[PDB]
Design a protein around this motif. Sequence first.
Motif, PDB file in Angstrom:
ATOM      1  N   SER A 199      -9.714   3.076   0.060  1.00 35.00           N
ATOM      2  CA  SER A 199      -9.459   4.072   1.135  1.00 35.00           C
ATOM      3  C   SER A 199      -8.614   3.445   2.280  1.00 35.00           C
ATOM      4  O   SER A 199      -9.138   2.769   3.172  1.00 35.00           O
ATOM      5  CB  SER A 199     -10.810   4.649   1.631  1.00 35.00           C
ATOM      6  OG  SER A 199     -11.666   3.651   2.179  1.00 35.00           O
ATOM      7  N   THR A 200      -7.289   3.667   2.214  1.00 37.32           N
ATOM      8  CA  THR A 200      -6.319   3.146   3.217  1.00 37.32           C
ATOM      9  C   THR A 200      -5.202   4.228   3.321  1.00 37.32           C
ATOM     10  O   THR A 200      -4.146   4.092   2.699  1.00 37.32           O
ATOM     11  CB  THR A 200      -5.819   1.727   2.779  1.00 37.32           C
ATOM     12  OG1 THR A 200      -6.915   0.816   2.733  1.00 37.32           O
ATOM     13  CG2 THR A 200      -4.775   1.101   3.716  1.00 37.32           C
ATOM     14  N   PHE A 260       1.215   5.038   1.221  1.00 41.14           N
ATOM     15  CA  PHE A 260       0.098   5.415   0.313  1.00 41.14           C
ATOM     16  C   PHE A 260       0.142   6.945   0.008  1.00 41.14           C
ATOM     17  O   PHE A 260       0.576   7.752   0.838  1.00 41.14           O
ATOM     18  CB  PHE A 260      -1.207   4.987   1.046  1.00 41.14           C
ATOM     19  CG  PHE A 260      -2.560   5.227   0.349  1.00 41.14           C
ATOM     20  CD1 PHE A 260      -3.259   6.419   0.576  1.00 41.14           C
ATOM     21  CD2 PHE A 260      -3.185   4.194  -0.360  1.00 41.14           C
ATOM     22  CE1 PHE A 260      -4.574   6.558   0.141  1.00 41.14           C
ATOM     23  CE2 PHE A 260      -4.501   4.336  -0.793  1.00 41.14           C
ATOM     24  CZ  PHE A 260      -5.198   5.512  -0.526  1.00 41.14           C
ATOM     25  N   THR A 261      -0.336   7.317  -1.193  1.00 40.20           N
ATOM     26  CA  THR A 261      -0.441   8.739  -1.626  1.00 40.20           C
ATOM     27  C   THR A 261      -1.956   9.142  -1.604  1.00 40.20           C
ATOM     28  O   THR A 261      -2.679   8.727  -2.518  1.00 40.20           O
ATOM     29  CB  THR A 261       0.205   8.977  -3.028  1.00 40.20           C
ATOM     30  OG1 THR A 261      -0.307   8.069  -4.001  1.00 40.20           O
ATOM     31  CG2 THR A 261       1.739   8.855  -3.023  1.00 40.20           C
ATOM     32  N   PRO A 262      -2.488   9.943  -0.627  1.00 38.16           N
ATOM     33  CA  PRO A 262      -3.911  10.391  -0.619  1.00 38.16           C
ATOM     34  C   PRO A 262      -4.420  11.205  -1.845  1.00 38.16           C
ATOM     35  O   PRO A 262      -5.528  10.950  -2.322  1.00 38.16           O
ATOM     36  CB  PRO A 262      -4.026  11.175   0.705  1.00 38.16           C
ATOM     37  CG  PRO A 262      -2.922  10.619   1.599  1.00 38.16           C
ATOM     38  CD  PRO A 262      -1.789  10.301   0.624  1.00 38.16           C
ATOM     39  N   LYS A 263      -3.611  12.152  -2.361  1.00 37.86           N
ATOM     40  CA  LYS A 263      -3.953  12.959  -3.562  1.00 37.86           C
ATOM     41  C   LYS A 263      -3.866  12.063  -4.838  1.00 37.86           C
ATOM     42  O   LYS A 263      -2.792  11.569  -5.196  1.00 37.86           O
ATOM     43  CB  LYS A 263      -3.005  14.188  -3.618  1.00 37.86           C
ATOM     44  CG  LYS A 263      -3.399  15.253  -4.668  1.00 37.86           C
ATOM     45  CD  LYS A 263      -2.491  16.499  -4.704  1.00 37.86           C
ATOM     46  CE  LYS A 263      -2.644  17.435  -3.489  1.00 37.86           C
ATOM     47  NZ  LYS A 263      -1.794  18.632  -3.621  1.00 37.86           N
TER      48      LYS A 263
END
Length: 17
Positions: A4-5, A10-13
């Motif tokens: 969790s970053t 970064f791509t959250p999905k």
Amino acid sequence: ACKSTQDPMFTPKGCDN
């Protein structure tokens, strides 16, 4: 189990949304 970053490069999905 993904790290969790939530940042612009970064791509959250698919990792941590």
